[PDB]
Amino acid sequence: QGTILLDLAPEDKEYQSVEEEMQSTIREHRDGGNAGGIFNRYNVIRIQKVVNKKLRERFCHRQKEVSEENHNHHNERMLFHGSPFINAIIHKGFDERHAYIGGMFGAGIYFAENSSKSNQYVYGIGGGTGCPTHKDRSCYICHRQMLFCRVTLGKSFLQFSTMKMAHAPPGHHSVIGRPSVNGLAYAEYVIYRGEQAYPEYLITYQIMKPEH
Template identity: 40%
Template sequence: MALLEPLRKHEETYMKIEKKMRETIKSHNNGIPLSDYNIKKISRVVNKDLKRRHDNVKKLILTEMNAKEAELMELYHGSPNAMQIIKDGFSAQYSDNSNMFGVGIYFANFSSKSNQFAWGNMQGCPPHRDRSCSKCVRHLLVCSCFMGNIYRPTAPTRQVPKGFHSVAAEPGVVPSLCYPEFAVLNGDQALPLYLIEYTIVP
């Protein structure tokens, strides 16, 4: 069972999330004019089943790595299915190897990059079919991503080599990238922490 606990606007956690979201706006060649966010609500995600699954996969990966710890990253994920993800978790079955780094669940450390996928890949809002719509409410998830053994590619690849649990791709290392890109291979490696409901300011 999933619960959403709304944060108060003057709560420290709310202000921290709001500040970071605004600080991670970048310019993208995507036809979506974005100068700011109009944040409607920020809620804490409470789902004990997803937390249990997340803890279990962490233990399995650490055992496989013969390690005591591995990198944990807080990243953004934009999706029209955010409410379903909060309930059921992430699943790689909705991904395919046509993605830049193959099958996986993709995340970003810039809110504006994840905002591009708020309606899906290259999709617009359902009522207006407009990627740059500033009227319809979008959903952005802040997630805790357990990276395990990280693959750091130098070029796009359709399949991550065996023995790796995630991808961390950097611009300058991967020539076609403008901004960092991250992916986990197992959906349970990513735990939704907060749901941000917002509209964009052109």
């Protein structure tokens, strides 16, 4: 039994709540739109819920463990994740063994509370070379995907200056760093264990051109 993908109807309050959080967390990045493209709204064309019994059990077991090490607060949070491994992730779950040891904060899995930040990672670091078909980081044609996940943060460690960690600091279960661009800092939430994140919603969308 693998993963079941369930479509949510747009009139479903669940669909509406997820699209609302995605649309409303679009922020300015002072990058000129280089990484994720130029837009100020998304055309959300599909929202599917990822249902996988085995994964959920892995996740909840770990959330209990974190509860017990954090004075009964697992500190769960709904965060967005954009990357090129989404399809692999929805079928097998997050696997930290595939993590890049050279991340600003180490070999962990990264999340953000702003959908526009996550959109910058859909095609790779800094937006890589853009969509496969058009090699366009601001492609209005190709459908993108991003996950809205339940992330178990437990006790988070606030990191300012870069630190190439392999695991959460002793006594902690996640790392939160506030990175710099050309003035704006947005938080990055990092975990180092695949089971501290569950890919709740699979969002299929397109960025939209600023209207004329």
